[PDB]
Amino acid sequence: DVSFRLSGADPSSYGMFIKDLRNALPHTEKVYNIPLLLPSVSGAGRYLLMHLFNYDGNTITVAVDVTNVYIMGYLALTTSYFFNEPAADLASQYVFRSARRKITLPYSGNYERLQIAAGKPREKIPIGLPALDTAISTLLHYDSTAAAGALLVLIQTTAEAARFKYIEQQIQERAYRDEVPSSATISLENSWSGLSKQIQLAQGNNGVFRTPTVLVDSKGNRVQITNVTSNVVTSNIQLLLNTKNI
Numbered sequence: 001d002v003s004f005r006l007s008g009a010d011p012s013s014y015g016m017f018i019k020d021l022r023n024a025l026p027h028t029e030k031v032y033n034i035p036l037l038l039p040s041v042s043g044a045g046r047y048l049l050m051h052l053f054n055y056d057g058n059t060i061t062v063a064v065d066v067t068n069v070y071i072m073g074y075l076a077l078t079t080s081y082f083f084n085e086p087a088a089d090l091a092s093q094y095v096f097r098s099a100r101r102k103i104t105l106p107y108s109g110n111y112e113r114l115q116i117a118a119g120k121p122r123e124k125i126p127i128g129l130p131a132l133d134t135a136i137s138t139l140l141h142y143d144s145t146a147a148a149g150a151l152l153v154l155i156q157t158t159a160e161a162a163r164f165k166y167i168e169q170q171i172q173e174r175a176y177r178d179e180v181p182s183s184a185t186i187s188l189e190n191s192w193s194g195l196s197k198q199i200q201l202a203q204g205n206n207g208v209f210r211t212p213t214v215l216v217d218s219k220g221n222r223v224q225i226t227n228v229t230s231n232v233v234t235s236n237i238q239l240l241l242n243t244k245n246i
């Protein structure tokens with residue numbers, strides 16, 4: 001398990017949490033020095049538990065699929081909540097079985113559905129450590145519209161930060177003041193599957209991507225990534241989605 005406490009949190013302790021989260025994900029290979037997530041894991045070992053504590057010390061436990069860093073569901077007191085998705089339904093066979101009741105949320109966990117449920121795109125939802133504290137608090141008591149927004153915050157401040165150092169740093173900058181994600185942040189989130197694939201394809205193509213990946217940089221300019229010498233590959237991305245899952 002990994003844990004993060006918002007009480008006394010600062011950029012350093014958040015950084016330690018994200019490092020723990022990355023290190024909890026199993027891999028047998030690295031591809032261009034980036035850990036390659038496993039094609040599959042059977043049984044309960046597929047799921048990592050993240051224990052998150054809000055500023056008041058109340059807690060939720062979030063189940064994460066270790067092959068893709070997707071959040072499947074979470075436990076709040078004696079109630080479990082899962083996305084309306086076959087993969088989350090499967091997760092519910094292994095995690096939080098001692099919950100007194102299980103609620104299936106009225107949406108799947110992908111960005112498009114969550115944004116529809118929340119009533120706003122995540123370009124408009126502030127993120128940061130205060131937003132994460134709020135999100136944990138929201139998830140403690142069921143409200144599906146509010147939860148969709150909280151889950152968008154949760155996904156970006158945990159999973160997305162684990163995947164990209166740039167995103168981790170963006171959250172560190174928002175340790176004491178929320179701010180909507182940069183356009184670069186959104187671009188990276190949207191491109192993880194694509195980048196993971198092209199980095200793996202580059203292995204037998206002399207470090208060259210079979211298909212260029214288009215991204216937005218910190219400045220707001222649109223740029224093409226074509227090979228593994230790009231800063232996004234050498235410095236930023238921290239986990240690769242296995243091509244068998246793409």
Ligand SMILES: *[C@@H]1O[C@H](CO)[C@@H](O)[C@H](O)[C@H]1NC(C)=O
Nearest residue numbers: 208225226227228229230231
């Ligand atoms: C590879 O990407 C680097 C970094 O962006 C770029 O400067 C260079 O033009 C590219 N080289 C090749 C051979 O694709």
Ligand SMILES: NC(=[NH2+])NCCC[C@H](N)C(=O)O
Nearest residue numbers: 069070071072109110155159
């Ligand atoms: N990167 C993440 N933690 N994403 C959470 C979403 C998980 C959800 N099961 C999905 O369909 O993606």
